[PDB]
Amino acid sequence: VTAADITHDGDVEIVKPQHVICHLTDENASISMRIKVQRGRGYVPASTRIH
DNA sequence: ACAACCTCCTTAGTACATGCAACCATTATCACCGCCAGAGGTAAAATAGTCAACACGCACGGTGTTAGATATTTATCCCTTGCGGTGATAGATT
DSSP states (O other): OOGGGOOOSSSOOOSOTTOOOOOOOSTTOOOOOOOOOOOOSSOOOTTOOOO
C-alpha cells in the first residue's frame, strides 16, 4: 500500500513515494481510508490541542 | 662402616609498577718553618710608545628654511540593502 494507491481529495504534492504503509494478499482483497494533512510551522501534542 | 633420619641449630636469599616534587651541609688535623729556587721584584734599554703640545682637518648635528606629504575636509560614486514578484527548483516521474 503505497503512493501509487493514493487519491488526491485536496491540494497535496507528495515528495515521499517510498513511504509504504501496509499490505494485502488476495485477488479480491481491499482497504480504504481518508487522511487529514497540515503544514503550519509549529508544534502541539495530539491530546493537548485543547480548543 | 656408613646412611639418613629425629629434633630445633643458624644461615641468608628474595620482597611488583609508573610518576612528580627538593635543598646540597658535617670533620679537624700543630704543617709546623727551614731552605732556596730560577724567581719575585725593579732598575735601566730593548720592543719601540705614550699623549700632550700645536697644529691640523673634518664630521656631525642643530638651527634654520624649504619641500611635499598626508589627513583632513568636502563631495561624489557604486555596491549594497531589504522587500517583493514570481521564479524551474527539489526530485518524482517519464
